[PDB]
Design an enzyme around this catalytic site. Structure first.
Site, short mmCIF file in Angstrom:
data_model
loop_
_atom_site.label_atom_id
_atom_site.label_comp_id
_atom_site.label_asym_id
_atom_site.label_seq_id
_atom_site.Cartn_x
_atom_site.Cartn_y
_atom_site.Cartn_z
N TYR A 9 -27.19 24.44 109.64
CA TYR A 9 -26.55 24.35 108.33
C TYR A 9 -27.26 23.39 107.39
CZ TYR A 9 -22.90 26.60 110.99
OH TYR A 9 -22.19 27.48 111.78
N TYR B 24 -15.99 19.59 116.52
CA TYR B 24 -16.76 20.16 117.58
C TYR B 24 -16.54 19.38 118.88
CZ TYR B 24 -19.77 22.14 113.81
OH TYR B 24 -20.31 22.77 112.71
C1 AKY Z 1 -19.92 40.40 114.31
C2 AKY Z 1 -19.96 41.54 115.34
C3 AKY Z 1 -20.21 40.85 116.63
O1 AKY Z 1 -21.36 40.08 116.67
C4 AKY Z 1 -19.06 39.92 116.91
C5 AKY Z 1 -19.33 39.12 118.12
O2 AKY Z 1 -20.18 38.02 117.79
C6 AKY Z 1 -19.47 36.77 117.85
C7 AKY Z 1 -20.41 35.66 117.37
C8 AKY Z 1 -19.66 34.36 117.10
N1 AKY Z 1 -19.59 33.28 118.10
C9 AKY Z 1 -18.31 32.94 118.63
C10 AKY Z 1 -20.49 32.18 118.01
C11 AKY Z 1 -18.53 34.58 116.09
O3 AKY Z 1 -17.81 33.34 115.91
C12 AKY Z 1 -17.37 33.13 114.56
C13 AKY Z 1 -16.47 32.07 114.36
C14 AKY Z 1 -17.02 30.84 114.73
O4 AKY Z 1 -16.02 29.74 115.02
C15 AKY Z 1 -18.27 30.46 113.96
O5 AKY Z 1 -17.95 29.82 112.75
C16 AKY Z 1 -18.54 28.56 112.56
C17 AKY Z 1 -18.96 28.44 111.14
C18 AKY Z 1 -19.25 27.10 110.59
C19 AKY Z 1 -18.87 25.91 111.51
O6 AKY Z 1 -19.19 24.77 111.12
C20 AKY Z 1 -18.40 26.25 112.98
C21 AKY Z 1 -18.73 25.81 114.21
O7 AKY Z 1 -17.77 27.50 113.13
C22 AKY Z 1 -19.24 31.63 113.77
C23 AKY Z 1 -20.15 31.42 112.68
O8 AKY Z 1 -18.58 33.00 113.65
C24 AKY Z 1 -17.56 35.63 116.61
C25 AKY Z 1 -16.22 35.21 117.22
O9 AKY Z 1 -18.28 36.77 117.11
C26 AKY Z 1 -20.07 39.90 119.16
C27 AKY Z 1 -20.57 41.19 118.96
C28 AKY Z 1 -21.20 41.88 120.00
C29 AKY Z 1 -21.33 41.30 121.26
C30 AKY Z 1 -20.83 40.01 121.48
C31 AKY Z 1 -20.22 39.33 120.42
O10 AKY Z 1 -19.72 38.09 120.60
C32 AKY Z 1 -20.89 39.43 122.77
O11 AKY Z 1 -20.37 38.30 122.88
C33 AKY Z 1 -21.46 40.16 123.83
C34 AKY Z 1 -21.52 39.66 125.14
O12 AKY Z 1 -21.04 38.42 125.44
C35 AKY Z 1 -22.04 40.42 126.19
C36 AKY Z 1 -22.53 41.70 125.96
C37 AKY Z 1 -22.49 42.20 124.66
C38 AKY Z 1 -21.97 41.45 123.60
C39 AKY Z 1 -21.92 42.03 122.31
O13 AKY Z 1 -22.38 43.18 122.14
C40 AKY Z 1 -20.20 41.90 117.68
C41 AKY Z 1 -18.79 42.46 117.89
O14 AKY Z 1 -17.96 41.87 118.58
O15 AKY Z 1 -18.43 43.65 117.32
C42 AKY Z 1 -18.06 44.54 118.38
C1 FAD Z 2 -12.03 28.84 114.43
C2 FAD Z 2 -13.09 28.32 113.48
C3 FAD Z 2 -13.24 26.98 113.23
C4 FAD Z 2 -14.05 26.49 112.23
C5 FAD Z 2 -14.68 27.40 111.41
N1 FAD Z 2 -15.47 26.94 110.40
C6 FAD Z 2 -15.56 25.61 110.12
C7 FAD Z 2 -16.31 25.14 109.04
O1 FAD Z 2 -16.80 25.89 108.24
N2 FAD Z 2 -16.38 23.77 108.81
C8 FAD Z 2 -15.76 22.86 109.62
O2 FAD Z 2 -15.86 21.74 109.37
N3 FAD Z 2 -15.03 23.34 110.69
C9 FAD Z 2 -14.91 24.69 110.94
N4 FAD Z 2 -14.20 25.13 112.02
C10 FAD Z 2 -14.05 24.14 113.13
C11 FAD Z 2 -12.65 23.56 113.32
O3 FAD Z 2 -11.89 24.01 114.40
C12 FAD Z 2 -11.78 23.62 112.08
O4 FAD Z 2 -12.39 23.00 110.99
C13 FAD Z 2 -10.41 23.05 112.56
O5 FAD Z 2 -10.46 22.24 113.66
C14 FAD Z 2 -9.26 23.99 112.83
O6 FAD Z 2 -8.08 23.28 112.99
P1 FAD Z 2 -6.81 24.12 113.32
O7 FAD Z 2 -7.08 25.45 112.97
O8 FAD Z 2 -5.67 23.59 112.66
O9 FAD Z 2 -6.62 24.15 114.89
P2 FAD Z 2 -5.54 23.48 115.84
O10 FAD Z 2 -5.86 23.90 117.15
O11 FAD Z 2 -4.15 23.78 115.50
O12 FAD Z 2 -5.84 21.95 115.65
C15 FAD Z 2 -7.02 21.37 116.02
C16 FAD Z 2 -6.82 19.89 116.32
O13 FAD Z 2 -6.05 19.32 115.30
C17 FAD Z 2 -4.79 18.95 115.75
N5 FAD Z 2 -3.72 19.17 114.76
C18 FAD Z 2 -3.24 20.35 114.35
N6 FAD Z 2 -2.30 20.17 113.44
C19 FAD Z 2 -2.15 18.86 113.28
C20 FAD Z 2 -1.33 18.09 112.47
N7 FAD Z 2 -0.56 18.69 111.64
N8 FAD Z 2 -1.42 16.77 112.50
C21 FAD Z 2 -2.30 16.22 113.30
N9 FAD Z 2 -3.11 16.91 114.07
C22 FAD Z 2 -3.04 18.21 114.09
C23 FAD Z 2 -4.56 19.64 117.07
O14 FAD Z 2 -3.63 18.99 117.90
C24 FAD Z 2 -5.98 19.68 117.60
O15 FAD Z 2 -6.27 18.47 118.18
C25 FAD Z 2 -14.54 28.78 111.62
C26 FAD Z 2 -13.79 29.22 112.67
C27 FAD Z 2 -13.58 30.70 112.77
#
Ligand code: AKY
Ligand code: FAD
EC number: 1.1.3.45
Length: 492
Positions: free
Chosen positions: A369, A441
């Site tokens: 990023y 994380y």
């Molecule tokens: C999009 C379609 C497809 O790729 C989906 C799936 O891929 C993930 C990639 C990400 N991952 C968790 C890192 C995505 O997270 C999300 C949420 C996250 O929390 C992430 O978000 C970040 C963004 C920014 C942040 O700071 C932070 C940490 O979170 C990420 C960017 O996107 C998400 C949940 O989907 C996937 C596919 C296909 C296969 C797998 C997939 O996981 C497989 O896992 C897999 C396999 O294990 C064994 C054999 C085959 C395959 C696949 O063919 C596709 C699909 O599913 O369509 C059918």
């Molecule tokens: C699933 C997911 C997470 C992402 C995504 N993209 C992010 C991004 O673009 N930037 C970031 O900085 N972080 C991203 N994250 C990572 C993180 O998981 C999220 O930012 C948050 O942690 C999500 O929190 P939440 O959805 O609320 O999850 P919970 O499990 O309910 O809580 C996590 C943590 O916080 C405590 N907690 C919840 N609620 C409270 C209150 N009300 N008060 C205090 N503490 C609270 C929980 O107990 C737990 O410890 C993109 C994707 C897809």
């Protein structure tokens, strides 16, 4: 609605399986579905009287599924509490923890044309996202979300054993300001339960809400650049890596054109087909298109392969509200991040290529990023988000569907991480090259000695010199240690 109590009720399965990560599923005696802070007070008092270990769920995106730990006996679910409004009185904006980022984005924008620099995923919860300093595409431009935190309403527990509702504001004369401070990137399950957050840009004059937080971009211009794996060589991948990293070190941390750009470089494995650079910027800034192709032209300058480019200009909210994070059944994950102060080394880049190029048996990837920007303008000590001099953030993961393969997947993600941070003991130790990792994380491997972490504790890793100050908060507002989990702040 009055407090709800879910015990062997038909609603149980739904509540216990709300977590995002399929790996961990809760088994508490009860789940309390709260609708007001006073209800939160009641729920806490009832669980303590039952000696039920408490956990709060807002959004359910906890990567380590802490809330679903088998020791948890009480889960307070805030998902019914998602009110968002402005308060003319307080000169601040109301947001409840149950609200999703997507919802807050939509409410803030449509009524006032404004936003907060929060995360990307629309289904993410505000509750456990803001207090750990979730960042997003506008951080470069406006900084962390917690850089716009004015106040927090919390339920805390007394030395005497009493639940109480308290307000903590950023005013210099506020006796609870250290509690407010704790909520600007101390992380989730440590200081009490947030029942409401207040936002206002510290640099904000007047009574007009539209000018009290940053204004949304005119539009979002996007380029997706993709490079196929078959035409990728170790040498070209590395030029790309080295090129990406040299640029980020020259271009950020200020209030410039490129402060408004965001990109995610998805370094997918060799099953995925290609690596993808996803870039975006406010389509209303002068020579917008020009800064974007100038950047990718820097990214693959010494490269041997020419990428594909998809361009598009969409409305800011529409672009913002894409649910393009479809799990697609693969709901099991393991991940681990890092803050880079300087680009990867020759060797780390090479660690990256070999592990990504391999015919692993798992779905691995490395995301890089663009970061820095305005975040780096706040003193490290001015918030509880210490990392204020990094140029790039990284998040590494494995994603899968079958629990029978947990072992193979787990092996994969740990191996890439330890190997690129191998010269320290498998962890990003804050030094001249990194600034540790990010509380939202969680990685409980940071506390496993039979892995990495050579000499450095987990809390150094996440909070650097800020930890003692957080320890003293822990002791004052949670003396009975009511709020805890594996990577929890400890009293001194
Ligand atoms: C999009 C379609 C497809 O790729 C989906 C799936 O891929 C993930 C990639 C990400 N991952 C968790 C890192 C995505 O997270 C999300 C949420 C996250 O929390 C992430 O978000 C970040 C963004 C920014 C942040 O700071 C932070 C940490 O979170 C990420 C960017 O996107 C998400 C949940 O989907 C996937 C596919 C296909 C296969 C797998 C997939 O996981 C497989 O896992 C897999 C396999 O294990 C064994 C054999 C085959 C395959 C696949 O063919 C596709 C699909 O599913 O369509 C059918
Ligand atoms: C699933 C997911 C997470 C992402 C995504 N993209 C992010 C991004 O673009 N930037 C970031 O900085 N972080 C991203 N994250 C990572 C993180 O998981 C999220 O930012 C948050 O942690 C999500 O929190 P939440 O959805 O609320 O999850 P919970 O499990 O309910 O809580 C996590 C943590 O916080 C405590 N907690 C919840 N609620 C409270 C209150 N009300 N008060 C205090 N503490 C609270 C929980 O107990 C737990 O410890 C993109 C994707 C897809």
């Amino acid at each position: 609605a009055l407090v709800k109590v879910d015990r062997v009720d038909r609603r149980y399965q739904d509540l216990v399986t709300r977590g995002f990560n399929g790996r961990f599923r809760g088994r508490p005696d009860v789940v309390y579905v709260v609708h007001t802070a006073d209800q939160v007070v009641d729920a806490v008092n009832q669980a303590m009287a039952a000696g039920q270990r408490i956990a709060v769920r807002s959004g359910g995106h906890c990567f380590e599924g802490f809330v679903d730990d088998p020791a948890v006996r009480a889960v307070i679910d805030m998902s019914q509490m998602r009110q968002v409004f402005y308060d003319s009185g307080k000169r601040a904006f109301a947001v409840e923890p149950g609200a999703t980022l997507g919802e807050t984005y939509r409410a803030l924008y449509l009524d006032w044309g404004v936003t907060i620099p929060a995360g990307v995923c629309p289904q993410v919860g505000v509750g456990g996202h803001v207090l750990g300093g979730g960042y997003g595409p506008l951080s470069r431009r406006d900084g962390v979300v917690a850089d716009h935190l004015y106040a927090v309403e919390v339920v805390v527990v007394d030395a005497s054993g009493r639940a109480r509702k308290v307000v903590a504001t950023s005013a210099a004369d506020d006796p609870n300001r250290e509690l407010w401070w704790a909520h600007t990137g101390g992380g989730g399950g440590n200081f009490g339960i947030v029942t409401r957050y207040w936002f206002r840009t510290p640099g904000a004059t007047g009574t007009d809400p539209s000018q009290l937080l940053p204004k949304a971009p005119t539009s979002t211009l996007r380029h997706i650049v993709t490079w196929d794996w078959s035409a990728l060589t170790e040498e070209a991948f590395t030029r790309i890596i080295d090129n990406h990293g040299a640029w980020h070190q020259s271009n950020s941390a200020a209030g410039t054109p490129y402060a408004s750009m965001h990109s995610v470089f998805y370094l997918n494995s060799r099953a995925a087909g290609q690596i993808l650079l996803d870039i975006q910027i406010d389509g209303g800034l002068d020579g917008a298109e020009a800064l974007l192709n100038d950047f990718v032209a820097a990214v693959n300058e010494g490269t041997g392969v020419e990428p594909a480019v998809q361009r598009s200009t969409e409305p800011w909210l529409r672009a913002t509200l894409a649910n393009k994070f479809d799990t697609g059944g693969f709901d099991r994950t393991k991940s681990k991040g890092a803050y880079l102060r300087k680009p990867w080394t020759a060797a780390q880049a090479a660690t990256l290529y070999r592990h990504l190029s391999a015919d692993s048996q798992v779905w691995g990837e490395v995301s890089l990023y663009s970061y820095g920007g305005k975040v780096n303008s706040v003193p490290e000590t001015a918030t509880a988000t210490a990392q204020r001099d990094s140029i790039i953030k990284v998040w590494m993961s494995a994603t899968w569907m079958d629990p029978a393969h947990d072992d193979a997947n787990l092996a994969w993600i740990r191996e890439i991480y330890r190997e690129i941070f191998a010269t320290t003991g498998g962890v990003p130790v804050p030094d001249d090259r990194t600034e540790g990792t990010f509380i939202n994380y969680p990685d409980v491997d940071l506390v496993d000695e039979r892995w990495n972490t050579s000499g450095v504790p987990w809390y150094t890793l996440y909070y650097k010199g800020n930890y003692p100050r957080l320890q003293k908060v822990k002791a004052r507002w949670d003396p009975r240690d009511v709020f805890r989990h594996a990577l929890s702040v400890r009293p001194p």
